[PDB]
């Protein structure tokens, strides 16, 4: 909690300009910060707003320092410095503290040192929890599943059998990992189930949001690269493969057997077709209708934005009949 500004500036490799004996109690926004609070500023436009901010210290760039109206920590990337200093003064609790007796742990489960299991959490057989692992309350970890060192589950997370989670991963509540993929063969109208015997491999330093679903593979595995981040309400179907350090926002639906490359950034509520591949360093804007593969990096977009209803009604009808007008235009030529 409470720390000294000068010491804090050292841990952030920052340029302390002002009283170093200033005691910082926490982090806050410009709008809201008071005394004991350190904040930051990423946009140059909010330079004037520094004279309305009751914060003790503001993280800015060297070119912002003339505008400073308080103590200042200068850096190259205020936003990254915010991330770091926020971690130091992080008020966030843990999913649990050590092993709750309320839990139901199978005798064959192999625990690391300093493992925590939440209340009424259920661990199946053959499960291996690494060192400093934290299982939130009401969680369920399936048979023979591996969770790497320092990884943590919030309350009510579901991990199926044979799942492999790397080191220092975080999973928010409601999320389900390793459920049957949507695999069905058709016999004369009837659906015959295709047992999904693949798994989910999750790399290191992967963070998944809440109420997200990553299905196990049909035969081979579903793989999440390292340093990957996924938001809430995402659907990641069987046999999808995601490259290291890729980002997926909220509400993304991925079809099966999709390969997403490294350092991609998938916009929210986007919808991605399957059995195809996306190259490295691709950015799909929100609500992206990704019907085709993407071979070259860059930004891709789709979807007509909002219009007033009466305007839309007429916009929609003309597009639906755009072929008719394309023809009566071709004739006019």
């Amino acid at each position: 909690a409470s720390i000294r500004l000068a010491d804090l500036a050292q841990q952030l490799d920052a340029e302390l300009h002002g009283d170093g004996d200033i005691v910082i109690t926490g982090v806050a926004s410009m709008q809201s910060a008071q005394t004991g609070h350190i904040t930051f500023m990423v946009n140059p436009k909010y330079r004037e707003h520094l004279g309305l901010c009751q914060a003790s210290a503001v993280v800015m760039t060297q070119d912002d320092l003339p505008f400073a109206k308080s103590a200042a920590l200068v850096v190259k990337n205020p936003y990254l410095t915010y991330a770091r200093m926020a971690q130091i003064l992080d008020t966030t609790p843990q999913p649990a503290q050590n092993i709750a007796p309320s839990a139901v742990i199978d005798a064959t489960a192999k625990l690391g040192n300093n493992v925590s299991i939440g209340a009424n959490a259920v661990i199946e057989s053959g499960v291996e929890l690494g060192d400093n692992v934290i299982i939130g309350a009401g969680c369920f970890v399936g048979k023979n599943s591996k969770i790497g060192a320092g990884s943590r589950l919030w309350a009510n997370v579901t991990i199926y059998h044979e799942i492999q989670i790397g080191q220092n991963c975080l999973i928010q509540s409601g999320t389900v990992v390793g459920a049957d993929g949507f695999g069905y063969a058709n016999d004369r109208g009837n659906w015959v189930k295709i047992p999904q015997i693949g798994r989910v491999i999750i790399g290191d330093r992967v963070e998944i949001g809440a109420c997200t679903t990553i299905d196990r593979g049909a035969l081979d595995d579903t793989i999440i690269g390292n340093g990957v981040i996924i938001d809430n309400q995402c659907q990641i179907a069987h046999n999808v493969v995601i490259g290291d350090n890729t980002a997926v926002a909220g509400g993304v639906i991925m079809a099966g057997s999709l390969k997403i490359g490294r350092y991609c950034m998938i916009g929210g509520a986007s919808v991605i077709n399957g059995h195809m591949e996306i190259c490295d360093k691709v950015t799909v804007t929100g609500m992206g209708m990704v019907m085709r593969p993407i071979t070259e990096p860059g930004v891709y977009s789709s979807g007509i934005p909002l219009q007033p209803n009466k305007v839309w009604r007429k916009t929609a009808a003309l597009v639906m009949n755009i072929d008719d007008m394309s023809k009566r235009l071709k004739s006019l030529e």
């Binding site: 209803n309 009604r313 007429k314 929609a316 009808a317 009949n321």
Partner: protein, 49 residues
């Protein structure tokens, strides 16, 4: 003649079940049939006549 077209496409909204796209599309369909460039049956019949 107009009325048969209305029936094919489908007060339009209150009695005959129209959606937001249909009343616009209905006007468009009359433009083609009658080649010429209104919320009830009666309003359509009288104007067009």
């Amino acid at each position: 003649r107009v009325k048969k077209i209305i029936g094919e496409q489908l007060s339009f909204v209150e009695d005959l079940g129209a959606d937001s796209l249909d009343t616009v599309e209905l006007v468009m369909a009359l433009e083609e049939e009658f080649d010429t460039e209104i919320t009830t049956v009666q309003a359509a019949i009288d104007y067009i006549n």
